[PDB]
Amino acid sequence: KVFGRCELAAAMKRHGLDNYRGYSLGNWVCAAKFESNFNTQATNRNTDGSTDYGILQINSRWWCNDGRTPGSRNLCNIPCSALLSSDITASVNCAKKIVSDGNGMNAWVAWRNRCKGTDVQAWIRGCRL
Numbered sequence: 001k002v003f004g005r006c007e008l009a010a011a012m013k014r015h016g017l018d019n020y021r022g023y024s025l026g027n028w029v030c031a032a033k034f035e036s037n038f039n040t041q042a043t044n045r046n047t048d049g050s051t052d053y054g055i056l057q058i059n060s061r062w063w064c065n066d067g068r069t070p071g072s073r074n075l076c077n078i079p080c081s082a083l084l085s086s087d088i089t090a091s092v093n094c095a096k097k098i099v100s101d102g103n104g105m106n107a108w109v110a111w112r113n114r115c116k117g118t119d120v121q122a123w124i125r126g127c128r129l
């Protein structure tokens with residue numbers, strides 16, 4: 001599923017991401033924009049052989065099981081395929097674990113390089129929330 005900007009903002013809010021660990025909704029929408037272009041089916045292979053999955057590009061090295069990332073963990077206790085669903089519940093629940101991990105949203109390279117410090121409120125502007 002390719003979400004619209006405000007549509008994703010509303011889904012993220014309903015799943016409790018708004019202000020989770022102090023990160024306003026705009027941060028999460030901005031991260032999803034640059035990680036996946038709002039596409040739940042996005043996948044990208046990393047140089048180390050792991051793969052990033054879904055709207056927030058969660059990596060199989062630590063967070064989900066894809067059966068082909070040797071030595072990796074599955075800290076969200078999910079198949080990586082669950083991160084590709086039109087329903088964002090699995091990605092949100094896993095993202096909540098990641099952002100509590102210690103480095104906050106810096107775990108998302110696209111957020112650090114393209115959202116951090118910017119006017120992230122723009123990403124929810126005009127949305128009926």
Ligand SMILES: [Cl-]
Binds near residue numbers: 025
């Ligand atoms: Cl915001």
Ligand SMILES: [Cl-]
Binds near residue numbers: 065067069
């Ligand atoms: Cl594996």
Ligand SMILES: [Cl-]
Binds near residue numbers: 086087088089
């Ligand atoms: Cl959803």
Ligand SMILES: [Cl-]
Binds near residue numbers: 022103104
């Ligand atoms: Cl933080």
Ligand code: NA
Binds near residue numbers: 060061064066072073
């Ligand atoms: Na894994």
